Amino acid sequence: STSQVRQNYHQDSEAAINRQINLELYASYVYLSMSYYFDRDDVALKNFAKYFLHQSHEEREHAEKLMKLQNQRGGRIFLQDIKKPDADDWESGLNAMEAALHLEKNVNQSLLELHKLATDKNDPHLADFIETHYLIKELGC
Amino acid sequence: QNYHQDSEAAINRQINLELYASYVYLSMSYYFDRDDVALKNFAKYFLHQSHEEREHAEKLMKLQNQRGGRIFLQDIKKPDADDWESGLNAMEAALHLEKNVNQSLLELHKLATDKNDPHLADFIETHYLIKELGCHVTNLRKMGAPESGLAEYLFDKHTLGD
Amino acid sequence: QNYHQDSEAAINRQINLELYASYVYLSMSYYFDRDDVALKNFAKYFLHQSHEEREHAEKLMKLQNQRGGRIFLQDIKKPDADDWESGLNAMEAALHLEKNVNQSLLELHKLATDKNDPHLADFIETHYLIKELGCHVTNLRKMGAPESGLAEYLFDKHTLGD
Amino acid sequence: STSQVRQNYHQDSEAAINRQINLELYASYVYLSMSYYFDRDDVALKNFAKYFLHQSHEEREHAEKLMKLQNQRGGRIFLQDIKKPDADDWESGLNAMEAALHLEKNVNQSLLELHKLATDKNDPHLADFIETHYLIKELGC
Amino acid sequence: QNYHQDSEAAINRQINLELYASYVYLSMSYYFDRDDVALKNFAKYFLHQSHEEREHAEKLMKLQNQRGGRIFLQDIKKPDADDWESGLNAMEAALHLEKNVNQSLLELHKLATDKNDPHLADFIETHYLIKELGCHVTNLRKMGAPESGLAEYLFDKHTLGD
Amino acid sequence: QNYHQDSEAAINRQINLELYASYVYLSMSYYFDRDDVALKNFAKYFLHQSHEEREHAEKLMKLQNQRGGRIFLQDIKKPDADDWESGLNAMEAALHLEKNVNQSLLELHKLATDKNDPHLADFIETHYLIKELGCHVTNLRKMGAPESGLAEYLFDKHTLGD
Ligand SMILES: [Mg+2]
Ligand SMILES: [Mg+2]
Ligand SMILES: [Mg+2]
Ligand SMILES: [Mg+2]
Ligand SMILES: [Mg+2]
Ligand SMILES: [Mg+2]
Ligand SMILES: [Mg+2]
């Protein structure tokens, strides 16, 4: 039924988190694909390949910090297929950055709609977790 | 010649198999992180292995890029369970999984007939991981798992705490 | 405006709740110090937590003094048991207690709507303590407590000895 | 009529640049407004105020580098009203970051639609200017 | 009392006036950057002044925040010309502009009656800038501008090259 | 495939165009060295540019050799004038020349579709040289050239003496 640690954790947030977990795993897959595109000698842009491999590891680390939260609050993790990124070729180097911009802002407006949902269900703990997660993801550098 | 496009496909399939394995141990790790499961070293064990299997996927990605092949990703499927039931059952599953991933790893080397013997370094370690999961499965059963929640507790401490 | 005197009362009530919690873990600590109970690390665990919850009470006292409120102490009630029966039962009790103290801690922040987010640092750690007592309760039950006096003995050694 | 230095500069690009100039001036105004919001003692978040003041100076510097381009290619600069940013209060600190995300991606997808238009009108010079402008604006840190 | 909200409005209006001035000299700077105008030091002169007038706007923003007022931004209007015709005409325009911005700067001090005399530091420099634009206008006219394109060329070199 | 032999021809034609430009500015330089013309800095300006355009020709020669193409030289034609009439007229000519050489430079990049973007570094600077010759032409006309021999004298001193 229900977890001995659960407290003030709306079913709606538990499911928004499960979706955010898959989203960030998807983003990690996309970045990984883009990284090894700029690895191939067709392209051989080592600084792009480095940059995206870094962002792929960081998006995967965020997914784990989301999974750690779910467990900390008695939510239950439910994983789905990590879907194939919708390109293999990425063509240009700036066609990649365009794709990363729609992904990065999709990931981010999903966090904000999770902060919205957090203050709806008066959940200071979640709200504060997402907020600090969002500002480090943006203002870290 | 149909070797380059068979070697290319095999590596493409091995990339997906290692990534899937990384997904499975990730799933398993955070099952032992549940407050109602609560075996920290079981969690550490699988999370560490989850990173090993992703390292291997990138090495297969690096490799296909040097062979002049093309990387062709596919969906990473969800693993068969959300609830892994017990410490014993998670190990038995890893053992089962690692053997099959090992089998198609062979055929990629079996067709490779490569001068460099590419992935064979990593094929050698899969045989270490198999005997290890074997030894783990054995010890847990002999101790009384999975119905003896004391067995897995003490195995979490004494075997997976080093 | 009725916010200052509601914020003032909430903090006054949270002061008493943390002090009561410090009293409960003090009681629990010296139960495991009984010669007929004799679980030293269970004793250390609760005695340490008993000081944490008193630290928090003084921080709520410091806090009300900076908000210009007035501290209004009340009796610190005796805890519900003198005999805590078992290691398992003491944890289950702490879990129950910490959740309720957590609930009114929310409402003090829920009304605070404070620029500084005052006590929210300490509200974040109550959620760590809850998952921890959860994991403890789980491990003891899976091991066979509370009727297996061996379970609690080995949990005292292996989980609470670090 | 037409400038003695003009060469391969489509009228369409000259107008896309004039619009991009005003866009980045608008972005500089918005960032400046947000910066001095986090300056007021209601808020007093010095690190947010610092961050946005920096981004306000940088968006204004980009506008000048656009104006320098227009002149370098015989385009003619036409400036419009810099419109009042559509808030004074910015409320939260994360309500600001949300506003910056829709602004920042509006600014950026406007650059990309200018790179699109550049390769349409086979303008290697413009295309390369925008491309390097876009990657420094993103990968600078 | 209606002083705080009049002081607040004046500063709000002075913020917009300085920002507008920064816009005007920005416009003027890049007119002299045109390949068909081509007076680099005229360009440097106005671009530098364009930054001075923006510095002042932020100081008026900092100032309203310390007086506990609220900053209320408005549109920054486009300047009256896109083509500034000549070096002489741009100076005559700056002179005209700076005098009016100076006038409402007075009234903000004239009502301020402030203990600290806030913006009066910056009000003193507007009177230096006016006499300077005066001297510039004069020299260009005496030299034969704006119809003597040699006059402005040599003024660009000899007066605005230091 | 007809790209290698079109890329090869374009570079061959760009080699000749840059060499011709180097010849034109060489001619122009020593016109201002005539005792009856006598503008030293006009002479230095073009002689320096004459070397820049030859540097570029050799880089296009180095480039065709790395693309595995063959260098196919042609006559370097005499420039259209022996007498360049005035400082203004020499600049107007350079402006005209540099624009056309720029145009076929595009088409060599427009067909290149190269991974490395070879000559695009040098294509970017032609756009700096154009705006500069533009600014020069403008300043000389505004000053009264070419019939004002004082205009070109002072432009030789004040603009081309740095
Ligand atoms: Mg992320
Ligand atoms: Mg960013
Ligand atoms: Mg493997
Ligand atoms: Mg507490
Ligand atoms: Mg910008
Ligand atoms: Mg002023
Ligand atoms: Mg050239």
Residue numbers in the entry:
A (entry chain B), D (entry chain B): 4 to 144
B (entry chain A), C (entry chain A), E (entry chain A), F (entry chain A): 10 to 171
Study text:
As a standard structural component among protein nanocages, ferritin exists ubiquitously in both prokaryotes and eukaryotes. It is a nearly spherical 24-subunits protein with an exterior diameter of about 12 nm and a hollow cavity of 8 nm. Structurally, the 8-mer protein is a heteropolymer that is composed of two different subunits (Hα and Hβ) that originate from the same polypeptide. We have described here a protein-engineering approach to convert the 8-mer protein assembly with C4 symmetry into the 16-mer, 24-mer, and 48-mer protein nanocages with higher symmetry by controlling the intra- or inter-subunit disulfide bond.
To answer this question, we prepared the third NF-8 mutant termed Δ3C-∇C where cysteine residues (Cys90, Cys102, and Cys130) were replaced by alanine (Ala) while Asp144 was mutated to Cys. However, we excitedly noted that the inter-subunit S–S bond formed at subunit–subunit interfaces of the 48-mer protein nanocage when its crystals grew under the crystallization conditions containing Mg2+. The structure of the 48-mer protein nanocage in the presence of Mg2+ exhibited nearly the same geometry as the above-mentioned 48-mer with exterior and inner diameter of 17 nm and 13 nm, respectively.
